Amino acid sequence: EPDILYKRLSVLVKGHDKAVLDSYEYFAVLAAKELGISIKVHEPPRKIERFTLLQSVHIYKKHRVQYEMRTLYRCLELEHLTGSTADVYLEYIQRNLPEGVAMEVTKTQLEQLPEHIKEPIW
Amino acid sequence: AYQVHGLLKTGDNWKFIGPDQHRNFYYSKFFDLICLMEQIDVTLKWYEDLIPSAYFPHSQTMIHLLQALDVANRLEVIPKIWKDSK
Amino acid sequence: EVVIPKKKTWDKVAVLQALASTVNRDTTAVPYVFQDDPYLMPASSLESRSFLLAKKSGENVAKFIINSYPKYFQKDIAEPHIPCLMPEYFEPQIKDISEAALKERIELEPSTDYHFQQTGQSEALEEENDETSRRKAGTWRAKNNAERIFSLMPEKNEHSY
Amino acid sequence: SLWDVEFAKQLATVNEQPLQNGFEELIQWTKEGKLWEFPINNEAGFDDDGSEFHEHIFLEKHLESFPKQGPIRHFMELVTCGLSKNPYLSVKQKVEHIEWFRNYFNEKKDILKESNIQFN
Amino acid sequence: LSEYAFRMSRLSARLFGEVTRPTNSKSMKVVKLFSELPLAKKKETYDWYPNHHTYAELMQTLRFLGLYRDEHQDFMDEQKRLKKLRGKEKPKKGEGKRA
Amino acid sequence: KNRAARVRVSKGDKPVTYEEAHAPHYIAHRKGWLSLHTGNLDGEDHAAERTVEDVFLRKFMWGTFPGCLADQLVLKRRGNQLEICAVVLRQLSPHKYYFLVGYSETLLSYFYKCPVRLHLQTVPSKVVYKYL
Amino acid sequence: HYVDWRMWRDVKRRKMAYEYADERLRINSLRKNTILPKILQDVADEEIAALPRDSCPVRIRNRCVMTSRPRGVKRRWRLSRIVFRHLADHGQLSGIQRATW
Amino acid sequence: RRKALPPRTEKMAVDQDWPSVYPVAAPFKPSAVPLPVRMGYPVKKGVPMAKEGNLELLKIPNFLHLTPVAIKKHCEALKDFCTEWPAALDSDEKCEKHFPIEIDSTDYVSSGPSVRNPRARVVVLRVKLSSLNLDDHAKKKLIKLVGERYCKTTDVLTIKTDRCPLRRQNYDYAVYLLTVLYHESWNTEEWEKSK
Numbered sequence A: 001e002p003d004i005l006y007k008r009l010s011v012l013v014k015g016h017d018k019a020v021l022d023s024y025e026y027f028a029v030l031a032a033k034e035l036g037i038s039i040k041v042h043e044p045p046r047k048i049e050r051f052t053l054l055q056s057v058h059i060y061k062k063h064r065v066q067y068e069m070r071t072l073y074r075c076l077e078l079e080h081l082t083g084s085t086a087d088v089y090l091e092y093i094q095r096n097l098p099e100g101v102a103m104e105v106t107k108t109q110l111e112q113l114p115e116h117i118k119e120p121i122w
Numbered sequence B: 001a002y003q004v005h006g007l008l009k010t011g012d013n014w015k016f017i018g019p020d021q022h023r024n025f026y027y028s029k030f031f032d033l034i035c036l037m038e039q040i041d042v043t044l045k046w047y048e049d050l051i052p053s054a055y056f057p058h059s060q061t062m063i064h065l066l067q068a069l070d071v072a073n074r075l076e077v078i079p080k081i082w083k084d085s086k
Numbered sequence C: 001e002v003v004i005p006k007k008k009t010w011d012k013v014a015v016l017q018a019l020a021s022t023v024n025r026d027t028t029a030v031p032y033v034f035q036d037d038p039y040l041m042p043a044s045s046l047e048s049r050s051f052l053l054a055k056k057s058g059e060n061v062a063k064f065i066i067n068s069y070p071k072y073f074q075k076d077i078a079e080p081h082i083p084c085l086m087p088e089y090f091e092p093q094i095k096d097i098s099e100a101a102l103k104e105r106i107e108l109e110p111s112t113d114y115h116f117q118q119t120g121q122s123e124a125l126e127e128e129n130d131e132t133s134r135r136k137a138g139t140w141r142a143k144n145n146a147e148r149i150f151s152l153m154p155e156k157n158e159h160s161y
Numbered sequence D: 001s002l003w004d005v006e007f008a009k010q011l012a013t014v015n016e017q018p019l020q021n022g023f024e025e026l027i028q029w030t031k032e033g034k035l036w037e038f039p040i041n042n043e044a045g046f047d048d049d050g051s052e053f054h055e056h057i058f059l060e061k062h063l064e065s066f067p068k069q070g071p072i073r074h075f076m077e078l079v080t081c082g083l084s085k086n087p088y089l090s091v092k093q094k095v096e097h098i099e100w101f102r103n104y105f106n107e108k109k110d111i112l113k114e115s116n117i118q119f120n
Numbered sequence E: 001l002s003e004y005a006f007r008m009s010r011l012s013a014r015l016f017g018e019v020t021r022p023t024n025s026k027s028m029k030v031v032k033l034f035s036e037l038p039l040a041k042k043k044e045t046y047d048w049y050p051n052h053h054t055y056a057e058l059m060q061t062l063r064f065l066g067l068y069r070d071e072h073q074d075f076m077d078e079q080k081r082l083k084k085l086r087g088k089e090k091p092k093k094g095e096g097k098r099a
Numbered sequence F: 001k002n003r004a005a006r007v008r009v010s011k012g013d014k015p016v017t018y019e020e021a022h023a024p025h026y027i028a029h030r031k032g033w034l035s036l037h038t039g040n041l042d043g044e045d046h047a048a049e050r051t052v053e054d055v056f057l058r059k060f061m062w063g064t065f066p067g068c069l070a071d072q073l074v075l076k077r078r079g080n081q082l083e084i085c086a087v088v089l090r091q092l093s094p095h096k097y098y099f100l101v102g103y104s105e106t107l108l109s110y111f112y113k114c115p116v117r118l119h120l121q122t123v124p125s126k127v128v129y130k131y132l
Numbered sequence G: 001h002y003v004d005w006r007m008w009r010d011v012k013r014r015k016m017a018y019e020y021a022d023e024r025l026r027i028n029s030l031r032k033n034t035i036l037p038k039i040l041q042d043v044a045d046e047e048i049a050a051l052p053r054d055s056c057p058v059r060i061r062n063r064c065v066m067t068s069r070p071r072g073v074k075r076r077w078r079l080s081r082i083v084f085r086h087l088a089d090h091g092q093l094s095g096i097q098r099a100t101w
Numbered sequence H: 001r002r003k004a005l006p007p008r009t010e011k012m013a014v015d016q017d018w019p020s021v022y023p024v025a026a027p028f029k030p031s032a033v034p035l036p037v038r039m040g041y042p043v044k045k046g047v048p049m050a051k052e053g054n055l056e057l058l059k060i061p062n063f064l065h066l067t068p069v070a071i072k073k074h075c076e077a078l079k080d081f082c083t084e085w086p087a088a089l090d091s092d093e094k095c096e097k098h099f100p101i102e103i104d105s106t107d108y109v110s111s112g113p114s115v116r117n118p119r120a121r122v123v124v125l126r127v128k129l130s131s132l133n134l135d136d137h138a139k140k141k142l143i144k145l146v147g148e149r150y151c152k153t154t155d156v157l158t159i160k161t162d163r164c165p166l167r168r169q170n171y172d173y174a175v176y177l178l179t180v181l182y183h184e185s186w187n188t189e190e191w192e193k194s195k
């Protein structure tokens, strides 16, 4: 069975703080340079959610307590990788994935032409 | 002894230790052999890879180790050995 | 032009040996079966044996208290469904049956009850999951049961012998 | 076969090995079946009983006791289109709903006959 | 928007999998409700309140067997014992108002 | 007078630690959170069940060990992992400690349907940072 | 051992609505239909009205799983407004920090 | 009863491997780490906490298991399960001229034993229509039947497909839809003359 060749893929990593994800992307770019992937570095805009809630239990509306929700974004851009190399990279990422961040794998595979696209008549 | 060490846990840890008393006796015998065969480097390596990785020693093995350390000028860590023997 | 190489099929053994089984052994390292804190390090064989026996007794009493109340460990929340997360059953599941009920009572005061049920409902005891279980549990009683089964039923002789 | 079980238990208790580091711990956890399969995915376990796309899209092979032109056929096409774009239910539940609606429409036949139209 | 546009729209609806023939607005409720998950079968609707009775029974049977040291229930039992020893206990089954 | 989970200062005989001697407005500054998981971020489901499991685990660990917890619990939800980072005083026998550790590991792995490995930290006495 | 009754009634109603869901779905599908005669809609309304109460998703009240509070309950973590701030100040919710701007 | 044991700080050596001590991501045990690192907010006249009993060092995940030599050895040991990239697909132009069909994937993650994800069913199919055999009437009919699911600048067909819990079924359904689109473009119906 032929192997599935990929073109571009990104692993979005979103966490709470910043130092952990910075060290993680540094380790990722080191592993990419020590294997032959050649990636870059970028940072999408952040999103912070804030809501207003009450403070006491009775007539105490003039004193409110709010909370935040810091969720940064740090995604890479893996290019020029086959199937086995992408699987090995995903395995290495998952084997050292911390508990404070996430993972969004968006792989884009390649495909020549289907069986019915040339000159097919039903 | 070299064949036993190579067939123990170097390839497949299965026939290296069947229980606890037999494993301790084998470790003590290996330590005594390393202390009474080579000089002091092999004895120190055996004490670091057996006495510090498995458990403490017994009486004959401890006496043999003390004799090997005294015959090669190595009297400095006798208190820890005495505490382990006690 | 564009070459298409064949893919490699590896399961949970090749990657395991390539990741975990590619390091060296620590020098002064206690067995990792226990803990790593300095105050709870095994100093001799007695401490290791005691810790291992305590862990085994804890596992045994946990399994016992789970089997005592099976209605408290059934609401699953996982997805892959681990097969080692279901307690075993020891009560019979057939009442009007004969051979099936005897097999469920023997395999799944149990051997004697199964033998009595098989003798009452006229169930021929086979050479598997019957004689071996009676010999492992109960050895004059097992010999008497085998003799009674051979005198009341004449099936396979080599396995019975 | 109790003898085979005893032999397997003997092999297991003979080929036993203590733990050294966390690598052996994770190896034992993976061999026991506690961890997930690697390159974790989203189709391990729930595979819709191993079905394809023709059983989810093409649902015309499940409508036989219904006419071709009329309000009943319109309602059947509507419920078929509703069940088609539903990635939450399985095909078996769709067939169950279809047959339940069929039985419900075949039970109350007096209203369908008095509605100035015939029901097939 | 003429007959050709209507034919093209019906063809697209039949291809992609929509409603071919024209319908009204109330009839779209059936398809829009079958094309999603109902409220009475959501993953967070029925699972909003887990079986707390099982957890309560587990805590009770762990406190009884000594595997769980519940200080609150012990304090409640101590208060009940003190109230019964003071001289005001719980009456029997079928005695009190008519005593 | 807004008082939170902080410790009220009276005289000079209350040995407080670093967890009890901090205000909630210094969590992301001079403190931190006990647990850590991905359920709280925006865009992710399965959070109420995780909080219920966490509070149940905390209640169980506090009820099973009478005063053996010098502080709190540091849980880490890593996919299918539940690592317990608690402290135990040096007042009992190590055999009973290992017995309780094994019992808790087995119970948690058989209840939450997740592999659990405990990691203890022996403290010779009660944790203390200031005499507030 | 529980002490409240409204929480038990609410969880019973939730269970009965989860059990009685396909019939209500079919009745609601037969309802909102411009086509089909009115007699079927009328008999469907009569059937859905003849069913006993305490089995409808309308009666679902989003309460707390720790305090069983009727009003003022979040739908995210399924809890009230005081327990939320309480366990946030204690330090169980990672990331949920006090707003300092 | 009561006892005392020396830690691993004064028991190990200096020329010892580091990943052999902390293989898996351990929660930082103050025992085998000979680094007296102090983290915490001190007082005006005092000393902050060290490493023993430090809650800050326990809550924050430590990164001592990713030793550079260990990372290099792990990357080198995984060379057996890798496939070299062909030189014929280095530039993006040749990749688009040879493989003009892109199939995206949606694989997220969830905290806890839950593996199912309701947002892992979308698989957008991006096929560039600048390489297919499309004439004039056929291409016009295809554009009319598509509508707004086709970009007029980059000329990339973007069709959202999500009608099943799986992904390969959605891929096959999208392929079948594209096949029917290509078939209908070469057909002329009775009401096409009255355009």
Ligand SMILES: [Mg+2]
Residues within 6 Å of the ligand: F001, F002
């Ligand atoms: Mg104030």
